[PDB]
């Protein structure tokens, strides 16, 4: 039994995967305590773990968990079409930036944190450095919840966020491996400086610190980058951090399900749906489809109406809902993605920015699903592949199998048995 302290960024995607981790945890009778914003604690508390407060005076008590990204990704929808090189510049090293705005407002609140709860082992969900983690003097693992192709970085290999694999011309990579290190040197070089006044030394090229005791990421085995090695140095696989049961009320009438027809969960996740004129496109191709949607409306809900063929809501019951569907449409989230599969679902991937356009690459190359630009994809494309994944008994065999392997997965067990190792050896 041991104290187990998670700090995650205050986004679903990185307080989902924590949260899923830690139920798995608790079951080994492990103490599971969050370090969140107010707005986040009830939420966390309904899982029945303990929260500490973190202060954000720039964000109310009493906001909508889907306002700060959702307003986001609204402000940005411009570069929601752009391609993967236009949307670094203009949309992820802006994203970044908001991740190191959160980084610094809490960073000066975990030391005491930690000096008051004393826990045996923190695991961290974010994407840029915490010094009060590295200087805790205390064992930290690094989770991953994203797409996990940025673990397998290094020679040969493309980088993340660019849809890219291991048949892309040598060329393009280098080309692309040179953009990145260009694009972020300003951004890496203020980072740094915040980083040197806390004792921490800075990365070569990263701004976002690799554990030296373990890196958990959350990728089916049979999705894994193999082509690329093993699972990485001072890397652990969980094949999911699925949280099977979810305590948001459904979010329309369950009535809707007794409707005879395929049903199609339809969800660009927590803050994508804020894209209004997308959703309206989007919606409007669907509502020529002889199927039945539920979708995940998202922030501006009201701002528009889906037809008679569906029914929606700001945000869903997504975990009662996977098991009632037929196939998924998504945004290519790693929460989202993992999920359907858990549940034995093809899925149909609509990437808007990052890691999404790696796990839009990965369901075409596995043969799990298809992928296409949501901005651009035709009214036929849509259509005629929601036909075809539907009608494939072979990938529906495929996507059934994966599911299968991942709920049969022990590498919790392992996981388990790894921390308590790590605990030990630092004692
Ligand atoms: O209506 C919704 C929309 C999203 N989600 C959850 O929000 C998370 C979104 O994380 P993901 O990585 O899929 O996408 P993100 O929103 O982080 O881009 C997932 O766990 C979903 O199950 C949900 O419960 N209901």
Same mark, same amino acid.
């Given at each position: 039994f041991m104290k187990i302290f998670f700090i995650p960024m205050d986004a679903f995607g990185h307080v989902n995967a924590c949260i899923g981790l830690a139920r798995m945890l608790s079951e080994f009778e492990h103490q599971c305590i969050f370090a969140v914003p107010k707005r986040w604690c009830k939420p966390i508390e309904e899982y029945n773990f303990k929260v500490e407060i973190v202060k954000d @005076?720039?964000? %109310? #008590? #009493?906001? #909508?968990?889907?306002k700060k990204n959702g307003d986001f990704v609204n402000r940005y929808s411009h570069t929601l079409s752009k391609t993967p090189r236009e949307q670094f510049i203009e949309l992820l090293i802006p994203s970044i930036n908001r991740d190191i705005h959160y980084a610094k407002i809490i960073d000066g609140q975990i030391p005491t944190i930690l000096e008051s709860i004393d826990p045996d082992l923190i695991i961290i969900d974010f994407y840029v450095t915490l010094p009060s983690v590295v200087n805790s003097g205390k064992p930290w693992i690094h989770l991953t919840?994203? &797409? @996990?192709? &940025?673990?397998?970085?290094? %020679?040969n290999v493309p980088p993340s966020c660019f849809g890219l694999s291991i048949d892309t011309d040598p060329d393009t990579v280098i080309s692309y491996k040179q953009f990145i290190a260009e694009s972020m040197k300003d951004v890496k070089s203020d980072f740094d400086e915040w980083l040197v006044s806390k004792g921490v030394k800075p990365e070569p090229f990263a701004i976002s610190k690799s554990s030296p005791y373990l890196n958990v990421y959350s990728f089916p085995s049979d999705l894994d980058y193999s082509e690329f090695g093993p699972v990485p140095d001072k890397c652990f696989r969980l094949d999911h951090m699925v949280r099977l049961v979810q305590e948001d009320p459904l979010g329309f009438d369950e009535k809707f399900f007794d409707r005879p027809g395929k049903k199609i969960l339809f969800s660009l996740g927590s803050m994508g749906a804020a894209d209004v004129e997308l959703m309206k496109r989007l919606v409007g191709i669907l509502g020529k489809s002889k199927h039945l949607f539920i979708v995940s409306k998202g922030l501006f809900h009201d701002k528009y109406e889906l037809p008679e063929n569906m029914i929606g809501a700001k945000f869903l019951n997504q975990m009662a809902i996977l098991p009632r569907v037929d196939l998924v449409i998504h945004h290519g989230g790693n929460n989202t993605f993992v999920e359907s599969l858990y549940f034995g679902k093809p899925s149909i991937v609509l990437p808007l920015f990052g890691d999404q356009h790696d796990n839009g690459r990965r369901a075409e190359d596995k043969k799990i699903g298809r992928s296409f630009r949501p901005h651009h994809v035709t009214e036929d494309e849509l259509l005629m592949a929601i036909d075809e994944l539907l009608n494939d008994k072979e990938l529906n065999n495929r996507v059934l199998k994966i599911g299968e392997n991942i709920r049969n997965s022990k590498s919790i067990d392992d996981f388990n048995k790894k921390i308590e190792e790590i605990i030990k050896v630092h004692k």
């Open positions: @005076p720039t964000v %109310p #008590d #009493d906001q #909508d968990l889907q919840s994203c &797409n @996990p192709l &940025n673990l397998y970085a290094g %020679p």
